[PDB]
A paper describes a structure:
[name], a SET (Suppressor of variegation, Enhancer of zeste and Trithorax) domain-containing enzyme identified from [name], initiates DMSP synthesis by methylating methionine (Met) to S-methyl-methionine (SMM), with S-adenosyl methionine (SAM) as a methyl donor. The SET domain proteins are well known for their roles in methylating histone lysines in eukaryotes, and [name] represents a new member of the SET domain proteins. Each [name] monomer consists of eight β-sheets and four α-helices.
The crystals of the [name]-Met complex belong to the C121 space group, with two [name] molecules arranged as a dimer in an asymmetric unit. The electron density map of the [name]-Met complex suggested that there is a Met molecule bound in the substrate binding site of [name] mainly by hydrogen bond interactions. Residues Arg70 and Thr73 can form hydrogen bonds with the nitrogen atom of Met. Met132 interacts with the carboxyl group of Met. Moreover, Val130 participates in Met binding by hydrogen bonds via a water molecule. In the [name]-Met complex, the Met molecule is accessible to the surface, suggesting that [name] possesses an open conformation. During catalysis, Met is firstly bound in the substrate binding pocket, while [name] maintains an open conformation for the subsequent binding of SAM. Thus, the binding of the Met molecule may occur before the binding of SAM in [name], which is different from MmtN and DsyB.
Numbering used by the authors:
A (entry chain B), C (entry chain B): 12 to 171
B (entry chain A), D (entry chain A): 12 to 169
């Protein structure tokens, strides 16, 4: 079978993601728009092993390993879009992707950025439309920036 | 100030939780019913340092540190009830409680058990009310047992 | 059997240290002078599980867990004396004590402080007398202090 | 400056190793023979940031990150020869190479394989010369195999 990680040392037979199970979804410009699953996963299953390059600096497409070290993965896990009600969890100790919900073929895989990331490279507005969405997305240890308040501290006019 | 953790080694002025900020909710007997905040917390703030005793075995009131080690904390963090839309996050590398969202004084503190735990000592039905609530709660690496599959099926009659 | 950790939740049958295997060695004043073993351990064996209290601050009797968190263990592992040729290793991920060398009953268990500790609460002079001893003991990420140089930067007179 | 790691994502000015500081020693063919420092390093200094590729399987040139994950680094840190009295320490939480003692320009860089590795892809006889050298090298959680027990016994004839 064939794998997403371009390195030849990561084999699909060991658990690494296969293009027969996962699909990188593209924008109009040939950029990032998440990852689509193409087999059906029941919740509580390991969907894939994760790899990448060790780096000391948080960036786009890095995932946090521990307090000072991150995993640079522009091929797979770093492409996952945020959601406030994710269907997948990143286990950054075993380096594995696990189904939180039941996931049907064709569904978009989503993760809560704040469950792994202290801070993000860029805070942003969320469109998962979950009623419990946070609207403005930051790392778990990161305060909203000055744009962030506005959308937040403004949408608190929804008092009425 | 006086602290939730019995140990006199852990000091409130170093960020360990104080009863003037956290109330432990008990039932008619001794079994617990969550932790409530007495003060308001803005999102993205450290609410408390966490502590406990190292142990090798997952248990009631343990939180997972790494693949084979767990933190036994029956005084504070192991008392947090689960929710599928939690207001707090447990950081098990720095051992700290952070607010995921704005928390009003009096609010119950809830965490997603699956975001730290591989497996749970017991699976159980969830009543978080949330629209996206998984209804049946396991560890992240744990399949629903037959009871859980049954309820999950009886709910799939929709 | 009976265990060193005073907490009753840590059982000897699960691997936690027993006073039938280990002995806390005392000074003249009822203070710390290491840990003596009283069974024979071949190298490459797990001698004991380790426990203690989570703390955020490095102290005497704390062992480093990760970049910002330490294990306060005044009962067992924090009593171990330094050596530049240790016979035991602390596995701070599994929380376990393992024999590096062959260890005969009655031997003192010793560990290289710099293999787990970024910095120490107090730097000190070493007396393991190993020919490859470092003489002045610091954490792995810690420079000798101003006393430290002297013993070091002086004992480099041993040029002749 | 030009860096040991092929990846152009890792920059020397951020502390990743440079060939003006580190020389990789090759044998008559392609198999390696250690890493040598070209500059002097005082003890207690960060000599390099480390990197590599995450992998699930212990292997030649992997260093262990945690109980089930390993760092594949055939360019730098996985090339360090073992010594029972090493001059450098690998920090696998911060991913950095630190000097344990004073290191003169030209010196070989050596680490104690047992201080990071549970088990080794292969056990082997050690020639560090040190008085306290264990003579036979395994992982920290690994018993000497029959070859190693034999040599350890043939040495016990002392
Ligand atoms: C999608 S990877 C996790 C977030 C990334 N580090 C960022 O800052 O955008
Ligand atoms: C509230 S502590 C987290 C889960 C606990 N270890 C259990 O199994 O019940
Ligand atoms: C013997 S426990 C490890 C060293 C201790 N943290 C100290 O600073 O002395
Ligand atoms: C120099 S890399 C450390 C050990 C390596 N994993 C091996 O088994 O050979």
């Amino acid at each position: 079978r064939t794998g997403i990680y371009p390195s030849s040392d990561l084999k699909v037979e060991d658990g690494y993601p296969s293009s027969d199970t996962f699909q990188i979804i593209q924008t109009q410009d040939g950029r990032g728009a998440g990852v689509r699953v193409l087999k059906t996963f029941a919740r509580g299953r390991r969907m894939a092993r994760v790899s990448g390059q060790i780096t000391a600096f948080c960036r786009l497409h890095t995932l946090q390993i521990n307090a000072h070290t991150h995993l640079y993965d522009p091929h797979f896990s770093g492409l996952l879009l945020h959601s406030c009600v994710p269907n997948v969890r990143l286990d950054m100790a075993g380096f594995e992707l696990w189904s939180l919900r039941d996931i049907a073929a064709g569904e978009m895989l989503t993760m809560d950025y704040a469950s792994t990331e202290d801070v993000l490279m860029r805070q942003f507005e969320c469109h998962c439309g979950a009623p419990n969405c946070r609207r403005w997305i930051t790392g778990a240890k990161e305060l909203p920036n000055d744009i962030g308040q506005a959308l937040l501290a403004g949408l608190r006019a929804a008092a009425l």
